[PDB]
Structures are given as structure tokens and as C-alpha cells.
Amino acid sequence: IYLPIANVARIMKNAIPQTGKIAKDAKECVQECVSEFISFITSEASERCHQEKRKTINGEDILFAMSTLGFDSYVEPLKLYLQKFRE
Amino acid sequence: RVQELPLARIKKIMKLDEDVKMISAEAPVLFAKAAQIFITELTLRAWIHTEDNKRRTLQRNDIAMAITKFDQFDFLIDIVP
């Protein structure tokens, strides 16, 4: 299970200079990496929820897993995105 | 826009986890934005190796090199060998 390749490729293209090109196998590689990112963070959150005897993975569990595993810089932009999403 | 990412697909990936019971509504939304941040940073770091090799086409080996060089990407060790 992967996010749509066209969405992944669009985000990749926005990151590199306008004259750059991205090979199809690089797009497919990043598609795989994204899914592993989601599963890696989810595994950390799910083990914590299990230990704490809770049945629902909440947003705080995801953000805390990111903070623990080296993605603390994501916490503030994610909170802002979700809040703007809810407004 | 990050809103274009399908939340059902993100939820499906989460649900592969053997210990996931129920998922909050906000969890896939957070992952949608995180996916954009992650793709952008991984792509930029790989592009360092594209240019260092005098190329203008980003290739899979560039991603592999970026993963080895950044501690935050250690978890991709088996994905891009």
C-alpha cells in the first residue's frame, strides 16, 4: 500500500530546481520510503498505546512518536496544519 | 496541496500494524502533512548527490546515499539497500 505516485512525484518535483528531472525508479523508491515512514511512526505509537492500555491511536500519540524518533521538528508544522484544517 | 493526499490510503497503511485497533480522525491528517515534509527533505538531500555526480536526473542511488548519510533516515536502511 502506497500513496499515489503522481502525488509523490509532484511533491518531489517542487523540491528540486525547475530544470531537474526525476527518474521513475526514484519516484517509486520515495513512494516506498513514505509508506515505511508511516508504518515506522505508527509502530512506535501503537506499542505505546498498547502499553498504556488505550484502544485509539490519537494525534498526540503520532506526534510523540515522531518527537521520540528524531522528527521533533515536524510537531509544530503538523499542529498548525491540523488546526487550520479544522478551522 | 496536502489535502489531495487520500486519507483512506494513509489509514490503510496504519492498519497493517498488528497492534492498531482504532485510529483517531486526526491521525491520517497529521500523516498527510508529515508525508509532504518527509518527501521534500528526502528529495532535497538526495539531490545533493545528483549534483555532486554532475547529473540533472535524480536517481534511486542518490536516495540510497542520502539515507546512509542522515541519522533521521536510518529507518530506511532496508527499504533502499
Binding site: 508504518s39 515506522f40 509502530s43 | 498488528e18 541519522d71 536510518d74 529507518f75 536502511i77
Partner: peptide, 15 residues
């Protein structure tokens, strides 16, 4: 900081 989660994910992907 990722090591123990990496080891665990390898086991999950094998299944």
C-alpha cells in the same frame, strides 16, 4: 534513537 523501532519493523515486515 531509531534502532529499537527499526529492529521491530524488520520483524513486522517479514510477516
Amino acid at each position: 534513537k531509531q534502532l529499537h523501532r527499526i529492529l521491530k519493523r524488520r520483524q513486522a515486515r517479514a510477516k
